[PDB]
Amino acid sequence: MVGVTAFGNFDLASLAIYSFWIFLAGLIYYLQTENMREGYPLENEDGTPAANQGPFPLPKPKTFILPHGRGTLTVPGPESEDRPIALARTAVSEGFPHAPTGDPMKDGVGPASWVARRDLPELDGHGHNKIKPMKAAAGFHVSAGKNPIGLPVRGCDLEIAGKVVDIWVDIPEQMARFLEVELKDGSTRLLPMQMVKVQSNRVHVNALSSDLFAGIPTIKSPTEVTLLEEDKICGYVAGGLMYAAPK
Amino acid sequence: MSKFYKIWMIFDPRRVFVAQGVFLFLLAVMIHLILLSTPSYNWLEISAAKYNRV
Amino acid sequence: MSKFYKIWMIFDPRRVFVAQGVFLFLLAVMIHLILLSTPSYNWLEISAAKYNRV
Amino acid sequence: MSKFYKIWMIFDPRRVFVAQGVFLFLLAVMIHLILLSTPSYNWLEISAAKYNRV
Amino acid sequence: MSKFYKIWMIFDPRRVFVAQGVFLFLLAVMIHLILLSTPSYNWLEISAAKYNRV
Amino acid sequence: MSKFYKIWMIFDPRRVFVAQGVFLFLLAVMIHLILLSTPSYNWLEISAAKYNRV
Amino acid sequence: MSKFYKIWMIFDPRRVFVAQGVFLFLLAVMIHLILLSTPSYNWLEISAAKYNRV
Amino acid sequence: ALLSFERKYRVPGGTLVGGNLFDFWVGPFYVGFFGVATFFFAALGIILIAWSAVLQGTWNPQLISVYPPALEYGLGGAPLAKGGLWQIITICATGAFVSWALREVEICRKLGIGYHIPFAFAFAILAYLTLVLFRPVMMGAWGYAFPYGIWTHLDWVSNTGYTYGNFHYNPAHMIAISFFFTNALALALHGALVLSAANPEKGKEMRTPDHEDTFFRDLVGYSIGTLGIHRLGLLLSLSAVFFSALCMIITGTIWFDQWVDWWQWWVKLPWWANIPGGING
Amino acid sequence: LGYTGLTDEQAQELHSVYMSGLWLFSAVAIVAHLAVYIWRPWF
Amino acid sequence: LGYTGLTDEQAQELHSVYMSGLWLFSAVAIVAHLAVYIWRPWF
Amino acid sequence: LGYTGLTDEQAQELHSVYMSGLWLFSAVAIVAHLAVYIWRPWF
Amino acid sequence: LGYTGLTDEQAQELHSVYMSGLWLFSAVAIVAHLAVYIWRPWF
Amino acid sequence: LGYTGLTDEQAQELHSVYMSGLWLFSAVAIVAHLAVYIWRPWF
Amino acid sequence: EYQNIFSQVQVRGPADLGMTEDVNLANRSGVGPFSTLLGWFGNAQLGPIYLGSLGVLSLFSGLMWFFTIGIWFWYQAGWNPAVFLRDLFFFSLEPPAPEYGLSFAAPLKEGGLWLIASFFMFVAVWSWWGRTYLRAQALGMGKHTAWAFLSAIWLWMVLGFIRPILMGSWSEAVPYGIFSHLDWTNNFSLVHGNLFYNPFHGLSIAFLYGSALLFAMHGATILAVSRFGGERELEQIADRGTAAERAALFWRWTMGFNATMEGIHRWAIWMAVLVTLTGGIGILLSGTVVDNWYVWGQNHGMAPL
Ligand SMILES: CCCCCCCCCCCCCCCCCC(=O)OC[C@H](COP(=O)([O-])OCC(O)COP(=O)([O-])OC[C@@H](COC(=O)CCCCCCCCCCCCCCCCC)OC(=O)CCCCCCCCCCCCCCCCC)OC(=O)CCCCCCCCCCCCCCCCC
Ligand code: BCL
Ligand SMILES: COC(C)(C)C/C=C/C(C)=C/C=C/C(C)=C/C=C/C(C)=C/C=C/C=C(C)/C=C/C=C(\C)CC/C=C(/C)CCC=C(C)C
Ligand SMILES: COC(C)(C)C/C=C/C(C)=C/C=C/C(C)=C/C=C/C(C)=C/C=C/C=C(C)/C=C/C=C(\C)CC/C=C(\C)CCC=C(C)C
Ligand SMILES: COC(C)(C)C/C=C/C(C)=C/C=C/C(C)=C/C=C/C(C)=C/C=C/C=C(C)/C=C/C=C(\C)CC/C=C(\C)CCC=C(C)C
Ligand SMILES: COC(C)(C)C/C=C/C(C)=C/C=C/C(C)=C/C=C/C(C)=C/C=C\C=C(C)\C=C\C=C(/C)CC/C=C(\C)CCC=C(C)C
Ligand SMILES: COC(C)(C)C\C=C/C(C)=C/C=C/C(C)=C/C=C/C(C)=C/C=C/C=C(C)/C=C/C=C(\C)CC/C=C(\C)CCC=C(C)C
Ligand SMILES: [Fe+2]
């Protein structure tokens, strides 16, 4: 087949390369269409549908069957924010930021945003809660690191905010997820473990100042935390980085 | 021999039918490619030789 | 001997049948490839030489 | 022979039969390939030599 | 000697038997390969030379 | 002396037995390979030379 | 001896015995390999020279 | 314009240079100070590439090439049509890359996420700077860099590799290739596993991370986890790029001969140097 | 016995049908080898 | 034993069937080796 | 003591069967070595 | 004390059988070395 | 002290048996060195 | 300051035996030891591993392949452990010489033992592919891993089985050595002109660099949003949280377009199977259709001519 061309310089290599270009165009189209299953249709900044929607048409719906009788999820589907957003326009023209009306960490906007996830705890493959306090978890213990229980907690303002009392553990993955921190008023808050640095004699939280620890959203049941509570806590703690820069 | 029908008792017909379609087509294509590769049994070339098409 | 029927109380016929089919096809293909590879027993070129087609 | 039947009180016959099948097939293929690899005992080449195939 | 049977109260016979089978087969194959690689004791070449197979 | 048996209250017998068997086999193989690689004590070669096998 | 028995108040016997066994074996192997590497004291080659094995 | 959830995240803050100035979007893109800088540098580089194509006399995009100055210029300026355009485009490309990284930092701190992505990008920028700046500067000329062409920078790769014989005898090269291959394998396995859990057999419920853990524990006897697999992917990619940069930086600066000859230090170790057998004996 | 759940009668019937298939395949193969050996023997 | 759950009678019958199969396979192997050795001895 | 769950009697019988198999294997190996040594001694 | 866990009377019997095995193995080794030294001494 | 859990008598007895083992190993090494030095001295 | 690269506290509980969807639990083993180093980076638990019939087949054949290559290396070393360690990476099993073609008559020292090892390796790899398919099926999952592995197998088959048959010689195949197969790739590029000018070589390199790029991007993104529990992606698919939203908005504000928590994995799997698939095509084309890739590039507008 060496040198055997159908026409011009077109041989099996040229046939293969053009076939691959057509396949690659089709595959990119498929991949983008599959990407388009969340956040669409596009909106105007006043909430209405946008005149311009994009070159790629919206894919056909597909359905997930959630485990443990949690239901089904059809995407793309009718998605609403379902929460009030305390933001104000700074310009009539589009493309400009929206300014917080009040306290952005309290209101949950910007880097302090949270999503209205399900108000149920996340489950493992057996139906039990995925995340449990280490006292509830039977047979769990701290293995090979600096044990944080009892260490003082220090905010970004060089002041003590409380002490670590428990560790919340992801039972299936066998990893630590949250630090339970008791404040001065005898109330416990949860801090994401990705947001604290465990030092030799303290736990440092750079995102949050000592006073702001009081405003962390709490959990309604001491023995478990739901997905909505995880979003609220993590959004608050992460937004502390931008909205607690002074002090 | 008169009772081979019970094979469909144990095999899903749809998987079997798809599998044998793929198998038969691949086998036919392979045999045709083998025949074309050999200088003999390349029917186009031997017809060209037979009809003096240079 | 004459008790060999009891293997089916040990092995699931579906798995055995699929494995047997793939094994038989692969063995046949392997033996045909062995024969085609040798200059003798390549029936295509044997026929080509015998009928003076080259 | 004497009391070896008690092996089946220790081992699951399914695993034993599968291991035997795999081992026996692989060993037979290896020995056949070794025989084909020797210039003697390659039945194809020596049949070709003794019948003047090539 | 007389008291060795108590090895089986320490080791699982199934695991021991599987490891022992693998060990024995690999050892035997290695020794046969070592003999084959040796100009002498290559029984195939020895028989080829004795009977003038080449 | 006369109280070395207490080592078995320090070490788990099965772990020690596995390690000991692996160690002994590896040592023996290493020594056999060392003796094969030496032109002396290569028993196959010296047997071939004594009996005129080449 | 005098007061050394108290080292075992400090070090766990399993760790010490395992490390000691590994250390002693590796030391012995290293000394043996050093002796083999010198043309003198290489007991395999000097015996070959003494008995004219080559 | 916006995603269904985008509105609450567009807030006025997180810039590095400037304030409300440049704190706006153009369509989907965020355009800060470094957005303006990135756009300027990228447009300048692209127009200069087109003008170099005009100068060279070809319009075939696969034949367009922008060559570095010849070795006779050393580390100084060159005429525009004889290496100056390459230098200007290199400055523009460096500026575009660094401004892109800084823009990503601004987006990271507007969204409250960590700066892993700009760090990972900086690794690639350092590999590019190794090939285009550090190695030519140590070697003494801009002509040891590679040209800006689709098929001629491959000529640079070929010539540079074959100067030192067969190039995959360079050890750091071996490490970099191993990391690249392992990374592609890990990416395929990871994507396949996540998809298979999210897309089970028809009519089944979605699988859980326990099913993924069980799948790889059944297959290979070990599962690294979700956090573990993402850490592994990041580190595999970065280690591949780091070791490629190393193998190139030591290539014309410390080593000068065939690399297959470098591998002789292991063979010539004193205790087996002269044993008569095998390949090297 | 309990490995598959096939009755003894069921196993006998399945084995009978399977052996019919095996004999058919082997007879075709034997005829094939006879024809090839007559055409061009390998011994 | 408790390792596999077969009783003594089940094991004995299983071994009888297994040994019949083994002796058939070995008989075929011996016949093949005898044929090859008459055709081309390796000693 | 019985880490495997086998008692003294089970172990004794297991060892008896394993000894019988080992001695059979060793007898076959000894005969093979005797034949090879007669055919081609290595000493 | 027994860290792995064995009574002193279990340890004594395990060591007695282990010594039996060690002495058998080493006696076979002595005989092998004696044969090799007679055949081809290395001193 | 409480690092390992061995009391005074246990540590003393363990050291006694350990020293027995050390002296046996040393005596074997001493005999080996004497044999090697008689055969081929290094001083 | 914590970058979530290494765990700072490590917790252990009872080992997880796994799911029981329809897996034959008798074919599993026990849990292995826990490892603290792996715990620092990922999961500490080892095992349990499934080993069924296809596992026995794969283990036997792969063990025989490894053993055959190793025994050949020992033969080349002269049965000398020192030479074996010294000239390791220099030993090789070579395929038959070009005179033998595809025939199975090459001697054991020349190319027969290479054929034996290749048969063992073929069986091992195909049985391992079957094992991946069956392990996905037992748990009820999709077979994405099986088809990605099939792409990799396609490149392996082209290199070792398909192209030698089209070229009509086993000598075209790859040797079993460390430096030897590297020399094989160099000589392959030299004999066929310049493999840089193979366009499917270029696509394969594009997709390899793309795998590195994409999976640095994706690992960095998941690590960046893991403060919101982003690494638990299977539930971010079912319940979109702030982590997935922030990731999508980062990439949309950066490069104009984004993905989902599932579409990014589709991108990933395709970006890797494409490197191996295009590589297989490009290797199959070399020598059978194009004997000189630089001249092909000159004729196809890629080289100045
Ligand atoms: C005109 C020329 C141009 C041609 C094309 C132009 C046409 C226009 C453009 C068309 C492009 C469309 C691209 C979109 C595809 C995306 C689909 C997708 O991902 O999801 C849907 C679907 C499943 O979606 P899902 O939602 O995840 O399902 C979940 C299920 O519930 C549960 O899961 P499941 O059990 O159902 O299976 C899950 C899996 C399932 O999808 C599959 O089943 C794939 C089947 C394997 C691939 C087929 C090749 C195998 C050989 C044939 C023997 C088996 C055939 C029967 C397969 C069994 C199917 C029942 O889905 C995946 O996502 C796997 C992704 C990775 C697949 C990689 C396969 C590479 C194999 C390498 C083969 C190499 C040998 C030959 C190489 C080429 C020869 C030169 O997956 C597919 O359909 C995969 C399509 C496979 C494409 C094969 C590749 C073509 C290669 C051609 C290269 C270009 C030629 C240039 C060279 C020419 C030389 C002369
Ligand atoms: C002088 C050398 C030549 C050259 C010669 C070749 C040749 C020849 C080939 C490549 C191939 C490739 N080259 Mg090139 N290459 C050159 C220069 C480059 C440069 C560069 C910057 O210069 C780059 C980046 C590349 C990059 C690439 C890759 C994209 C591609 C290999 C994919 C892969 O993963 O293979 C590795 C993966 C596999 C082989 C798949 C393995 C799958 C099987 C199933 C694994 C079995 C494992 C076994 C069971 C293991 C047991 C393991 C134990 C269990 C642990 N080449 C120059 C021009 N290159 C290949 C290709 O496809 O080209 C089109 C190829 O064959
Ligand atoms: C390099 O090596 C060389 C090539 C030189 C030689 C190496 C060679 C080897 C090692 C060759 C191996 C040859 C072997 C071992 C062949 C085995 C052949 C067999 C065992 C064939 C059996 C074929 C049986 C077949 C097709 C069965 C057909 C049965 C049927 C259609 C009917 C089954 C239907 C059943 C319906 C189920 C219904 C019953 C119920 C109760 C529902
Ligand atoms: C390079 O070095 C070279 C190769 C040159 C030389 C180096 C050589 C070495 C190091 C050789 C080592 C040789 C060794 C160490 C050999 C050991 C061989 C053995 C240990 C063989 C065992 C044979 C035992 C056999 C087959 C088992 C017979 C067992 C049986 C049938 C099993 C029956 C047991 C039963 C069934 C269960 C009873 C059940 C109840 C309920 C009572
Ligand atoms: C390069 O260096 C060269 C090669 C030149 C030389 C360098 C050499 C070295 C460093 C050589 C090392 C030589 C050594 C140190 C060898 C080790 C020799 C030993 C100490 C071997 C142990 C032999 C003990 C053996 C086989 C044990 C047999 C034991 C048994 C069957 C034990 C039975 C245990 C039982 C049955 C269960 C009973 C249970 C109850 C409850 C009663
Ligand atoms: C002391 O150490 C011992 C001896 C115990 C073991 C140590 C061992 C060593 C040192 C093992 C060496 C392993 C190495 C160095 C392996 C090299 C593996 C490589 C690197 C292979 C590289 C490319 C190989 C490629 C593409 C193979 C493709 C192979 C194929 C598709 C298989 C083709 C199957 C077919 C050809 C032949 C068809 C014939 C029949 C009968 C089906
Ligand atoms: C050329 O020179 C080079 C460069 C190679 C190096 C030159 C020199 C060096 C640096 C040589 C190193 C020489 C050394 C430092 C050797 C160390 C030798 C030792 C420390 C040997 C200890 C031997 C002790 C032995 C075998 C004891 C084993 C003890 C036992 C059986 C007794 C244990 C039994 C017990 C414990 C039960 C315990 C009781 C209860 C109630 C649990
Ligand atoms: Fe992911």
From Swiss-Prot, chain A:
Where, subcellularly, is it found?
Cellular chromatophore membrane
Q: Does the keyword Transport apply?
A: yes
Kindly list the cofactors needed: a bacteriochlorophyll; a bacteriopheophytin; Fe cation; Mg(2+)
Q: What sections of the protein cross the membrane?
A: 12-31
- What is this protein for, i.e. what is its function? The reaction center is a membrane-bound complex that mediates the initial photochemical event in the electron transfer process of photosynthesis.
Name a single GO biological process.
photosynthesis, light reaction
GO molecular function terms listed in the Swiss-Prot or TrEMBL record: bacteriochlorophyll binding; electron transporter, transferring electrons within the cyclic electron transport pathway of photosynthesis activity
Q: Which CDD domains match?
A: PRCH
Q: How is the co-factor bound, per the entry?
A: Binds 4 bacteriochlorophylls per trimer.
One Pfam family of this protein, by short name? Answer: PRCH
Alphabetized, the UniProt keywords read:
Bacteriochlorophyll, Chlorophyll, Chromophore, Electron transport, Membrane, Photosynthesis, Reaction center, Transmembrane, Transmembrane helix, Transport
What is said about its interaction partners and assembly? Heterotrimer composed of subunits L, M, and H.
Query: Which family does the UniProt entry place this protein in?
Result: Belongs to the reaction center PuhA family.
Identify this protein by name. Reaction center protein H chain
Membrane association type: Single-pass membrane protein
Which ranges sit in the Periplasmic compartment?
1-11
Gene Ontology CC annotation, any one: plasma membrane-derived chromatophore membrane
| Membrane topology (Cytoplasmic) | 32-247
Give yes or no: UniProt keyword Ribosomal protein: no
Q: Which organism is it from?
A: Cereibacter sphaeroides (strain ATCC 17023 / DSM 158 / JCM 6121 / CCUG 31486 / LMG 2827 / NBRC 12203 / NCIMB 8253 / ATH 2.4.1.) (Rhodobacter sphaeroides)
Curated annotation (Swiss-Prot), chains B, C, D, E, F, G:
UniProt xrefs under PROSITE patterns: ANTENNA_COMP_ALPHA
Q: Where are the transmembrane segments?
A: 16-36
Q: Which SUPFAM superfamilies match?
A: Light-harvesting complex subunits
Taken from the UniProt entry, a GO cellular component term is: plasma membrane
The processes (GO biological process) annotated in the record are: photosynthesis, light reaction
Q: Which residues lie on this side of the membrane: Periplasmic?
A: 37-54
What are the binding positions for a bacteriochlorophyll in this chain?
Answer: 32
State its location(s): Cell inner membrane
Instruction: Please indicate which superkingdom the organism of origin belongs to.
Output: Bacteria
Membrane disposition = Single-pass type II membrane protein
* Main localization category: membrane
Pfam families named among the record's database cross-references: LHC
Biological role: Antenna complexes are light-harvesting systems, which transfer the excitation energy to the reaction centers.
Record family assignment: Belongs to the antenna complex alpha subunit family.
What is its quaternary makeup?
A: The core complex is formed by different alpha and beta chains, binding bacteriochlorophyll molecules, and arranged most probably in tetrameric structures disposed around the reaction center. The non-pigmented gamma chains may constitute additional components.
- Supply the name of the protein: Light-harvesting protein B-875 alpha chain
Which species expresses this protein natively?
Cereibacter sphaeroides (strain ATCC 17023 / DSM 158 / JCM 6121 / CCUG 31486 / LMG 2827 / NBRC 12203 / NCIMB 8253 / ATH 2.4.1.)
Curated annotation (Swiss-Prot), chain H:
Query: Which terms are listed as keywords in the entry?
Result: Bacteriochlorophyll, Chlorophyll, Chromophore, Electron transport, Iron, Magnesium, Membrane, Metal-binding, Photosynthesis, Reaction center, Transmembrane, Transmembrane helix, Transport
Those parts of the protein on the Periplasmic side are: 56-82, 139-170, 251-281
Q: How does it sit in the membrane?
A: Multi-pass membrane protein
The record lists a ubiquinone as bound by 216
What residues bind Fe cation, as annotated?
190, 230
Listed under subunit, the entry gives: Reaction center is composed of four bacteriochlorophylls, two bacteriopheophytins, two ubiquinones, one iron, and three highly hydrophobic polypeptide chains (designated L, M, and H).
The free-text function statement in the UniProt record for this protein reads: The reaction center is a membrane-bound complex that mediates the initial photochemical event in the electron transfer process of photosynthesis.
What's the name of the protein? Reaction center protein L chain
From the broadest rank down, the organism's phylogenetic lineage runs: Bacteria, Pseudomonadati, Pseudomonadota, Alphaproteobacteria, Rhodobacterales
Q: Which gene encodes it?
A: pufL
From Swiss-Prot, chain N:
Matching PROSITE patterns: REACTION_CENTER (PS00244)
BP GO annotations: photosynthetic electron transport in photosystem II
UniProt superkingdom:
Bacteria
Keywords recorded for this protein, A-Z: Bacteriochlorophyll, Chlorophyll, Chromophore, Electron transport, Iron, Magnesium, Membrane, Metal-binding, Photosynthesis, Reaction center, Transmembrane, Transmembrane helix, Transport
> Which positions in this protein are listed as binding a ubiquinone?
251
The positions annotated for binding (7R,8Z)-bacteriochlorophyll b are 181, 201
Gene name of the encoded protein: pufM
State the disulfide connectivity.
Answer: none
Q: How does it sit in the membrane?
A: Multi-pass membrane protein
**Protein known as:** Reaction center protein M chain
What this chain does, per the entry, is described as: The reaction center is a membrane-bound complex that mediates the initial photochemical event in the electron transfer process of photosynthesis.
Lineage of this protein's species?
Answer: Bacteria, Pseudomonadati, Pseudomonadota, Alphaproteobacteria, Rhodobacterales
